Structure 1
Amino acid sequence: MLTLARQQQRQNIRWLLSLSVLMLLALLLSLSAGEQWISPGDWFTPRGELFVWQIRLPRTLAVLLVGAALAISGAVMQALFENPLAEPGLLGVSNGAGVGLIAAVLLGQGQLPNWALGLSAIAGALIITLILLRFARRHLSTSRLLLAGVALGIISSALMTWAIYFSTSVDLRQLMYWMMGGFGGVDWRQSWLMLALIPVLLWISSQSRPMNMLALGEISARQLGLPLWFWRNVLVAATGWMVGVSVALAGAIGFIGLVIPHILRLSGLTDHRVLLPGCALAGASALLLADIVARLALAAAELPIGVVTATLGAPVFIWLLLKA
């Protein structure tokens, strides 16, 4: 090389620094925002362990995690399927978690101890992803595998919509909070899910090299020494697990794992060693903001993230393609 490593490395580090600082500020923002603004001064008062410890601290944390997860999953899939519209809830995994949830309610008669439902959601996701693996191991072309996945998702939609037809315990709003996402009822009880997300997130970020190789030809990558038939399976696995836990934790969340990686690329983040971490911080920040604006935007009740997320994101999004 000439000097390019310094120019590009320096601009990369500046980007990541900015993104992380934004995320921290969003953290303190949500840790204080709500019905009653609690300035850092009064963070240890009795109105601090209730509003800033057993309430916003785990919800905000879960938001950062799920946002990071979704955005990374986005990046990965878009690069695996070689297609712009690759989202995470596009192979049915997001819908599979739902079928698992309802299966749990109905079967369990609705007397489960809450967490049993979260576990079922993870199970639905795992089922689907495993099926997906059997469809990929057959050496099917990516073009065909994707289609097969879309189709799985289409089946699962029709499957969970039917189970809702018999359930007596069909709650009117819980459906809308589950199908547009929300962290309203998220306490430390969900701590296990938050743990289950961390390792996979870390690991998948470290994996920039093989994604930089996938960015070339299928063949150039095989030749440079990548095991495609493996990495494809791994990626689908990791993605499905992350989407699975996210849904088990907050429900079906869109927009993030579609736009957040596009926006980053449109701003010139091509390299994966900067895009993978980029996606995590931006995804986490975007979601956090959408949460801070979905819980205290309507004195009446709590909006679902699938509203505020798109409501603000897409306007801003057009503003970036329109000219920039």
Structure 2
Amino acid sequence: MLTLARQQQRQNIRWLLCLSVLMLLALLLSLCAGEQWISPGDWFTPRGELFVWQIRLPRTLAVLLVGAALAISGAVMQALFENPLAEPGLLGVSNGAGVGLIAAVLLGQGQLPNWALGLCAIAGALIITLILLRFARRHLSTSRLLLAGVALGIICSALMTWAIYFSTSVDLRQLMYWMMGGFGGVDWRQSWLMLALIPVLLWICCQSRPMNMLALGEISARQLGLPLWFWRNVLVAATGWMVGVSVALAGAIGFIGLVIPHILRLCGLTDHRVLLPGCALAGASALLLADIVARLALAAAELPIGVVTATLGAPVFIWLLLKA
């Protein structure tokens, strides 16, 4: 094995270690602070069974998964569209699931189960991710894709807002918490969605080869014997899956799919054999904090996870622009 290679791999394992830690260190912290603090020991008390197990844990688990997803998603999209600015939130694949999600809530309010909803979101994502990819093949451009995406996002936001006002079964809050993401109402009764995230999450996190290739660029990727169409479509699915579910789980959270991936490349995680796992870990932790903060900062009302991730996002992104 090449020298520079072995070394890089070492430092990579180093990060996958530190990151592996920070997440737990965050998983712990999430379970202890909600409104009132708690302690690992003061957990096994009548109170813990309530909060810590029936409230907190569920939520903290959803965050991890959604976080590790959105993070990976962005990674994946960037690979597909051969573009760093590729991410769920910006290109509008999130609002894609939005539309699809609401579509269900309106055609069968309260009748359709969460899992039944998840599928409707996964559809919302797939569509957009597809429409986007179509525009990606016919006119490969970082501007084009980044344009269309923003646009579709708007279109979807319109379809959503317009369909809510019409039915009047609107709640200025529900609408905002969704458009601006939030883990407020995450209960074990959504655990089916949570689980539904693990399969793909674990799978896609192992398909590094296809993406390193893919990353070289269409032609190179092809002439090297890569089943391009397959993997392109495959990831499109794996994307819509994770994305949609995440939306059904916590609405539209944005700006972690963009930043987390790049930051990890900065640390030297480039081989997708590392960037994926690295993304999962940095994705999870990253969103936990975001959630915890969204959870304490204003005692009167829980902050829309979205605002948080966005507030910290825009800045850490600007910096990334100057550094890269």
Query: TM-score scaled to structure 1, two decimals?
Result: 0.89
Shift of 1:317: 4.6
Separation in 2, partners of 1:84, 1:129: 16
Q: 1:131 to 1:43 in 2, by over 3 A?
A: same
8 Å CA contact 1:78, 1:87 repeated in 2: yes
Q: Against the structure 1 CA distance between its residues 38 and 109, is the aligned structure 2 distance closer, same or farther, given a 3 Å change threshold?
A: closer
Q: 1:258 to 1:130 in 2, by over 3 A?
A: closer
Instruction: Mark the CA change 1:189 to 1:269 in structure 2 (over 3 Å): closer, same or farther.
Output: same
> CA distance change for structure 1 residues 159 and 320 in 2, over 3 Å: closer, same or farther?
closer
Alpha-carbon deviation of 1:110?
Answer: 6.0
Q: Greater CA deviation, 305-314 or 17-26?
A: 305-314
Count how many residue pairs are aligned between Structure 1 and Structure 2: 324
Q: Deviations over 1:255-305 (max 9, x none)?
A: 101111121122322221111111111111110001011112211010011
Contact 1:137 1:229 in 2 (8 A): no
Q: Aligned-pair distance for 1:221?
A: 1.7
- Once residues 308 and 139 of structure 1 are traced to their aligned partners in structure 2, the CA distance between those partners, rounded to angstroms, is 34
Write out per-residue CA displacement over residues 52-92 of structure 1, whole angstroms, 9 at most, x where no aligned residue: 10011010010000011001110111121122221113444
> Which runs of no fewer than 5 residues in structure 1 stay unpaired?
none
After the TM superposition, which residues 50-65 of structure 1 pair with which residues of structure 2 at under 5 Å, given as runs? 50-65=50-65
Name the Cα RMSD after superposition: 2.8
Corresponding position of 1:120? 120
From the superposition, tell whether residues 226 and 189 of structure 1 become closer, same or farther in structure 2 (CA, over 3 Å): same
Distance 1:147 1:309 in 2: 22
Worse overlay, 114-123 or 168-177: 114-123
Give the 3-state SS of the residue equivalent to 1:48 in structure 2. Answer: helix
CA deviations over 1:156-206 (Å, ceiling 9, x no partner): 233222212202111011111001110111010010001111110111110
**Is the Cα–Cα contact under 8 Å of residues 73 and 242 in structure 1 kept in the other structure?**
yes
Deviates more, 1:144-153 or 1:115-124: 144-153
Deviates more, 1:35-44 or 1:72-81: 35-44
Q: How far apart in 1 are the matches of 2:140 and 2:207? A: 24
Question: Is the 1:31–1:56 contact (alpha carbons within 8 Å) kept by the matching residues of 2?
Answer: yes
Residue 135 of structure 1 deviates from its aligned partner by 7.1
CA contact (8 A) 1:254 1:306 kept: yes
Per the TM alignment, residue 31 of structure 1 is displaced from its structure 2 partner at its CA by: 0.8
Partners of 2:130 and 2:236 within 8 A in 1: no
Give structure 2 stretches of 5+ with no counterpart. none
Structure-1 separation of matches of 2:156 and 2:3: 52
Deviates more, 1:122-131 or 1:24-33: 122-131
Cα distance in 1 for residues equivalent to 2:277 and 2:18: 12
Q: Is contact 2:59-2:186 (8 Å) kept?
A: yes
Change beyond 3 A, Cα 1:162–1:54? same
Cα distance 1:86–1:128, how it changes in 2: closer, same or farther (>3 A)? closer
Cα distance, 1:229 vs. partner? 1.3
| Equivalent pair of 1:59/1:187 in contact (CA under 8 Å) | yes
1:1-324 alignment runs, 5 A limit = 1-108=1-108, 116-129=116-129, 152-318=152-318
Q: What is the CA–CA distance in structure 1 between the aligned matches of 2:78 and 2:37, rounded to whole Å?
A: 40
1:41 is paired with a residue whose SS is coil
Task: Give the 3 Å change call, closer, same or farther, for CA 126–8 of structure 1 in structure 2.
Answer: closer
Measured against aligned partners, the alpha-carbon deviations of 1:229-255 in whole angstroms (never above 9, x if no partner) come to: 111111111111110000000000101
Greater alpha carbon shift after TM alignment, 261-270 vs 65-74: 261-270
Question: C-alpha displacement at 1:220, in angstroms?
Answer: 2.2
Offset at 1:101? 2.8
* Contact 1:133/1:233 (8 A) holds in 2: no
1: CA distance, partners of 2:139 / 2:84: 23
Say which is worse superposed, 117-126 or 162-171, in terms of deviation.
117-126
In the aligned structure 1, how far is the partner of 2:89 from the partner of 2:65? 17
